[PDB]
Ligand binder design. Sequence first.
Ligand SMILES: CCCCCCCCCCCCCCCCCC(=O)OC[C@H](COP(=O)([O-])OCC[N+](C)(C)C)OC(=O)CCCCCCCCCCCCCCCCC
Ligand SMILES: CCCCCCCCCCCCCCCCCC(=O)OC[C@H](COP(=O)(O)OCCN)OC(=O)CCCCCCCCCCCCCCCCC
Ligand SMILES: CCCCCCCCCCCCCCCCCC(=O)OC[C@H](COP(=O)(O)OCCN)OC(=O)CCCCCCCCCCCCCCCCC
Lengths: 459, 120, 63, 98, 54, 64, 345, 53, 140
Amino acid sequence: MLKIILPSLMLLPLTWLSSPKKTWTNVTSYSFLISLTSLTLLWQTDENYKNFSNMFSSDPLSTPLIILTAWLLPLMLMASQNHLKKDNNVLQKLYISMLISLQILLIMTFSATELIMFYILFEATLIPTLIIITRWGNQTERLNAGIYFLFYTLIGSIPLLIALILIQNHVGTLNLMILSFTTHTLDASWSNNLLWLACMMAFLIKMPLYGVHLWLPKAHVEAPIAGSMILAAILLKLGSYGMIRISIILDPLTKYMAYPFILLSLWGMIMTSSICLRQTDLKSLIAYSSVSHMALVIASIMIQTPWSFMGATMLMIAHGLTSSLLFCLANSNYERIHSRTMIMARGLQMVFPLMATWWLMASLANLALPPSINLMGELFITMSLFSWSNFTIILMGINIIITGMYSMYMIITTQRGKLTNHMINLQPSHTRELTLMALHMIPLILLTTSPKLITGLTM
Amino acid sequence: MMNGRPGHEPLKFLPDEARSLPPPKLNDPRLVYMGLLGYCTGLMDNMLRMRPVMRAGLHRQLLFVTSFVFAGYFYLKRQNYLYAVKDHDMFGYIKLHPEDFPEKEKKTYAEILEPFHPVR
Amino acid sequence: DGPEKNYEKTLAILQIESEKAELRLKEQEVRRLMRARGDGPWYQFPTPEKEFIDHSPKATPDN
Amino acid sequence: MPSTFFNLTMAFSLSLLGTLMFRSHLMSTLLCLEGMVLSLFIMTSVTSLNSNSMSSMPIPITILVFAACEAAVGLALLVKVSNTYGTDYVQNLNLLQC
Amino acid sequence: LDLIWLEKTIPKSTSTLHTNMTTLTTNQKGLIKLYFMSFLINIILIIILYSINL
Amino acid sequence: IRWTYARSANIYPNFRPTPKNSLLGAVAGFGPLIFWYYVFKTDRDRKERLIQEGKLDRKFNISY
Amino acid sequence: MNPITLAIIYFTIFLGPVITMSSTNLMLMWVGLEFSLLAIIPMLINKKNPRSTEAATKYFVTQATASMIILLAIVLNYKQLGTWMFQQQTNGLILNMTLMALSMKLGLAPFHFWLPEVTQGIPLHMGLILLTWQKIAPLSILIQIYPLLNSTIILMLAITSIFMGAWGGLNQTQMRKIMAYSSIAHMGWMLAILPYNPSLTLLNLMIYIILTAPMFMALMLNNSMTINSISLLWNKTPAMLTMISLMLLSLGGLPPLTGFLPKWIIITELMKNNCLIMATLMAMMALLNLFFYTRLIYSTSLTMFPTNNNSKMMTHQTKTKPNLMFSTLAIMSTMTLPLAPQLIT
Amino acid sequence: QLLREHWVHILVPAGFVFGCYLDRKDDEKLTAFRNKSMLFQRELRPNEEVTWK
Amino acid sequence: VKRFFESYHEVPDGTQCHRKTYITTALGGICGIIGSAYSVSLNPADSTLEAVARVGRYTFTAAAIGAMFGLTTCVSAQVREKPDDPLNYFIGGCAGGLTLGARTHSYGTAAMGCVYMGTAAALFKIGKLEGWELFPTPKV
Ligand SMILES: CCCCCCCCCCCCCCCCCC(=O)OC[C@H](COP(=O)([O-])OCC[N+](C)(C)C)OC(=O)CCCCCCCCCCCCCCCCC
Ligand SMILES: CCCCCCCCCCCCCCCCCC(=O)OC[C@H](COP(=O)(O)OCCN)OC(=O)CCCCCCCCCCCCCCCCC
Ligand SMILES: CCCCCCCCCCCCCCCCCC(=O)OC[C@H](COP(=O)(O)OCCN)OC(=O)CCCCCCCCCCCCCCCCC
């Protein structure tokens, strides 16, 4: 794991020592090489998990998240290159440093084998996202968005810290593999119910429920493109990863203690898809779509079926890729027009043909299309939920119908129709942003071609 | 909590029993990180005084790194002594009071009946 | 290298973590017993010193 | 001796109540402080004389020295307060609340 | 829901509670007579707590 | 711009709690949750009772 | 001033806590406390403004009353046992009076009301000297009587100090009052962990001191008094901003800054002693502390408040920042979390 | 120092080499149960020092 | 009064509702007296009559909160026959919060008091059920 962490650590001296005319080139190229290096722990021949160190470990669950983070860092650099062109060199290098530190801390978080170290790196990732959102956001409400994001996360995470220290004082180790082996059943008391709530609510805040979710649209609207990318593609999945990790020591009482959150997830995915239907902001629409998909992930992890876990992992990776792609496309239009109003730019398929192709493919990934890991994850989540109770299929069907409706509504209202001819400042395309869309979409095709990698722990 | 132990000479940084312990290898992550902190201290001092960040004050940066490594080495040796003597006192107390720390026999997974909770 | 290297490394890591957990529980029990009845090296609260008691004969015999 | 020590403890309690309950006069507060000091001196002297602790007999002299030092500092601060305002009123010195 | 009532329930109500409580806490005048009266009340409460718990 | 601002950032500054909207928010935020709670709870209790009494058989359900 | 009386006053300021922490007689601890108070008063009233006079008066009467209660406790102990130290079998009333009076010396709630008042209206270096150096001698006396303390009164004082400090720092806009309420909250944490581990309150005291020394140094550099005054720091000293933000986050207790370590280890020890309710409440109010720190960070670092015309002349001139003191303490107070087993003792 | 100028291109490769070295050092650090597992526990071969390095 | 607050728990819930209501009302009255003393010390009234009025108002408000809490908790334990259950204490704490809101004349204060005080009372019932040691003597 150190062979991946240390080059990413040395990215920062490269960033601060590179010439100002070569900084973006050097950091982007070496971060691509670091992702290529991070591809090496897919070499999983045996069923044994790759335990490199006494503190670092690999997993069929942790590996796709690490590879996605290492892949997404150069994509964030490419996306954030254009909107920092009229900026001080020190500020540009500081922004690149924030992105690189996010990548380092997230790789360490996913590869950490101890829950307390996972918590430390969890809040360590909480810091530079706040700095990015507040310092480089565009509108006034970035400060409110940062406050909401930070303190939703912290009020979630403090009972998680209390619960982790309780578990460490009880069993003596707080190591994931020792807990997984000598896990102990809980005697179903009110203290154990509160312990379950304390160790769940941090991750239930971090990936959005129907309740606490109000920080996500604010942060996504007010964040720059790299911040939206890192949030919607890694941090919600970080909450899901934490839930999958910590659910193993709560064996007997999850089967009744998970009831309110399953209902909250299903009805909330319906309501957030409805908001996507009647939403006037493109980034808000993508954010609420992310809430709906993560609600599906919450329901699968709560019902704790092998099909549910596999579908949860597939939906995690697929949703990260397609949400980053949608955010990048919306950011390209926003860099053209300097407004996120959805109804204002309408006939963009006329002037941007292949960007419209990327829009069409991104929306076909957003809805569940059967040659895609999106439909793979959503379909196996549906199968596990219907096994859990047959009446969940009604909520699933309503969610799928509204999902198709808001995705095709997005395509029709922002690409098709008569072109708003008054918008003179529609530059043709940047090879950079077309490359950005291609680097989002081609991994979706490859993971569709071989979905055994995205299958998680259970099979 | 360990200040009242027998043989505790007061305000002694490193007693002779610490001489029984292996010292840090002088290139271990604690001391390398201490040197890195000293280097970052020098760089931050240059940036705050509005000098070139690394081109200026090489003697200051050298003194910072050297002092951080020196103090970190001696403090690390003291902490190794403290942890070692804590483990020694704990093991001695265990050996002194065996009736309060029974060697509990665990049985195999063939007599214990763990309840099974199906996840239908 | 092969599956045996990762297998044995995992076994060594598990042994280290299990011994550390056992020692942490032992440390908790030892500290609790010592503070409950201070008889080991730890939690030795002080006491007025013997070496400042005057044992010389006094002006009054009844001392 | 226990009755007298109870009376001295109650005298200290009364002087403490006087110190805590202000009546418009920093000088009266300092007077209550020195009443507390006098009560402590009498308590220490009576205890040392009863226990024949001639080795601990310098303790009342030490507390008297440090008490007069603090009374000196309080009188100097009262002089500065009077130079600032001219009335020496604890309710008049109140402008640090904001 | 998402623009009125979840907002009114969790974050805005928490912020309103804490700003009301910080106004109530920092509503002090700079009168050391009042401060020492409060200190006397603290001493009385500590004495009563000792006499009750014992 | 005015339409977008009125639809987005003006609603909570111009929201006033009334008993009507309090009742509406309570029913719209809790009634579906309680309804689907009782639906799933009754269905799962019936399924668990059938499995425990043996009247429900999994014919070829191997992977759930 | 005058160098001779500067030497006398500063030596007595040093000598007070040294006598208190190195003396085994309660009387000599009390005369050390008296030394500290009487020596620090002329350093407080030095600018000879009405605010300085008021702050000196308030500080004097508060510390004099608290020291008189301390001396009452010492004399009552001497009456009961004949010794000059609370050995093991003293009266709980005597011990509770000692704790209450030392709490009023320290300045934690509900005895906290004078501390933002005194810290306001006093120059920044004297506020630093107060909020760091004056809190070691009463803490030394409290550590000396490590058992035989009332855990109930300790936990009540700790929880109310953390609550009131969080609320006060949330309300205040004056930087010195913000620092005073931060002091109240951190003293609440130290007092909370006091009866279970003296090492952890010593560690939290050291972390707090090395965290708020460079905060006061950075305030002292530009003589910044208010939130607006610290907000126009991007024009005055733009290199300060990252260290200011990191130290404010470390005071908030965010991982992976080393200010997370004292709260983390105190919560760990309280879990070991089964005080989950107190630990949870303390952690939530620490989140409130982090909120007012983060508002400060928004003002000074992550946004750029408007500046005025004369800051051009300020940029024309040259400055001076203390070597070996600011940068060293800032680095050791931000990036020393992986040395946590070495820091705990 | 014959090439000079853009010297910074060895920083990330140096970090990668050092990371591989640290992984090798951790493998040498663990070293327990070299052939002591119940699963493999094979003979040491006529010409072989250790099973894995 | 330590034996008084222990005599609160000498009988199980749903028994001696009058005794439990009286004990909780006394506890609330003590808390209101302490709070009123702090209020009239820190923020003085314009005259002694207003000070006495504020003390009486605060004491009666806290006594009403305690009385309604104890009464509703014991009534719930009576009407559904399971005393060791935290939902009775949650209902009672919500009733106490509603009493607070009625005294303060604010439905928002009523709702927030209901939620917070019900959570606190349920946590207290769980603590008394499963032996949570508030203010523990140092052991480790
Ligand atoms: C962001 C989400 C916030 C809301 C949900 C948070 C979780 C809700 C349920 C858990 C209770 C509250 C958190 C407790 C954390 C520790 C849990 C734990 O260790 O439990 C086992 C412990 C019990 O320890 P135990 O299990 O060792 O008990 C001994 C048991 N025997 C004897 C059988 C071995 O639970 C507690 O101690 C709970 C005490 C809580 C006291 C503080 C409550 C504060 C207020 C509650 C809400 C706080 C968050 C919201 C703040 C406001 C936000 C707007
Ligand atoms: C793992 C975590 C990932 C997280 C995100 C990572 C992003 C960065 C990625 C960097 C590169 C990693 C690539 C990972 C995928 C590799 C795909 C691959 O080569 O898979 C192997 C597969 C043959 O392997 P095999 O064992 O036969 O497959 C399983 C059979 N039991 O090979 C093949 O089958 C050949 C594949 C290449 C040949 C071209 C395929 C063209 C497919 C056209 C599809 C058209 C329809 C698309 C419809 C889309 C609708 C939305
Ligand atoms: C359905 C699910 C239910 C379960 C989950 C419940 C919990 C969900 C998570 C918590 C809720 C979100 C909290 C964070 C967001 C709210 C805070 C906020 O944004 O406050 C803003 C406001 C200041 O506004 P400002 O921007 O300064 O003003 C305009 C320009 N000056 O700020 C203020 O006015 C003051 C803000 C104070 C700081 C708030 C955050 C800290 C909260 C501490 C909690 C303490 C708990 C214990 C309390 C005592 C015991 C009851």
